[PDB]
């Protein structure tokens, strides 16, 4: 049988799928993620903040 990928398939998004939140996923915390500090962030902390005495 043709073992190649099939061109001639609908390339468009499919508007026929459950649009609701899925209540069937692991609800527990995930113990599988980089636990390190992550040196990839903006070190210049000034783009937006509340300057009032009682902010």
């Amino acid at each position, epitope marked *: 049988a043709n073992p190649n990928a099939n061109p001639n398939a609908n390339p468009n998004a499919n508007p026929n799928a459950n649009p609701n939140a899925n209540p069937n996923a692991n609800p527990n915390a995930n113990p599988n993620a980089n636990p*390190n*500090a992550n*040196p*990839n*962030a*903006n*070190p*210049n*902390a*000034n783009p937006n903040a509340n300057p009032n005495a009682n902010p």
Partner: antibody, heavy 120, light 112 residues
Framework: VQLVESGGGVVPPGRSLRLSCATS????????MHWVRQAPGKGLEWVAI????????FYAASVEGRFTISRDNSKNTLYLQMNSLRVEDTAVYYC??????????????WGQGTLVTVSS | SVLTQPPSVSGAPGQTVTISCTGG?????????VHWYQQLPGTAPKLLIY???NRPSGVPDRFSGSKSGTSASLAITGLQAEDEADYYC????????????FGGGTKLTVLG
């Protein structure tokens, strides 16, 4: 924006050297800083970053534990204290001002650096 | 050397030359923006391109960038003799402990 650098010179291996990047034209205290280095004949290598308030210090794996990065917000000065210098640490060290765009950061200004030679 | 760059690029002045940079799924194809720096032969590098395509005002409108998958690029049009420099690409490698990673750097020689 201007970054002024000094403190290079020849230091025997095992000994320490302090670099100092004086800055002006901008509020030093509001920006993080970077050090990069380039050994003569080599490409660019990232060395360290300091967070504008000193809350984070990250180092290249090859220098962590030997190098210390610090910043004195009252003197507008960035420092790099290198202990246990090795011959392999000979390079022009440069300071640069931290900048950040979207998913990654970048430098937007460089000083001219100073040459640190580890020898004899 | 984290990002792959050719050691050399060249062309006659007036020509268009490009400097490539290729990474992996961890550093360029990872969604991290690529930046380019120009190191004139006897000085500190300067920002040439940022955000994959933009230039920092002072940079002549001869330089522009590009990004695709793990590929990144710097195009120099109207090549001048004065463009001789080492061009470097910069990104962030999610597998490493540092903040910035650099490519090997490409030396641009202008044949004139």
């Amino acid at each position: 924006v201007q970054l002024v650098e000094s403190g290079g010179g020849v230091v025997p291996p095992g000994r320490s050297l302090r670099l100092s990047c004086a800055t002006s034209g901008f509020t030093f205290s509001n920006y993080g800083m970077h050090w990069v280095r380039q050994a003569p004949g080599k490409g660019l290598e990232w060395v360290a970053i300091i967070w504008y308030d000193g809350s984070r210090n990250f180092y290249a794996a090859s220098v962590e534990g030997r190098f210390t990065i610090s910043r004195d917000n009252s003197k507008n000065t960035l420092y790099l204290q290198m202990n246990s210098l090795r011959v392999e640490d000979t390079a022009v060290y440069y300071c640069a001002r931290a900048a950040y765009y979207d998913t990654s950061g970048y430098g937007d200004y460089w000083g001219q650096g100073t040459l640190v030679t580890v020898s004899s | 050397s984290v990002l792959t760059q050719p050691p050399s690029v060249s062309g006659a002045p007036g020509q268009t030359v490009t400097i490539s940079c290729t990474g992996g799924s961890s550093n360029i194809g990872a969604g991290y923006d690529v930046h380019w720096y120009q190191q004139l032969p006897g000085t500190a590098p300067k920002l040439l391109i940022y955000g994959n395509i933009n230039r920092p005002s002072g940079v002549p409108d001869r330089f522009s960038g590009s990004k695709s998958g793990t590929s990144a690029s710097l195009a120099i049009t109207g090549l001048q003799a004065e463009d001789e420099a080492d061009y470097y690409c910069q990104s962030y490698d999610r597998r490493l402990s540092g903040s910035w990673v650099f490519g090997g750097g490409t030396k641009l020689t202008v044949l004139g």
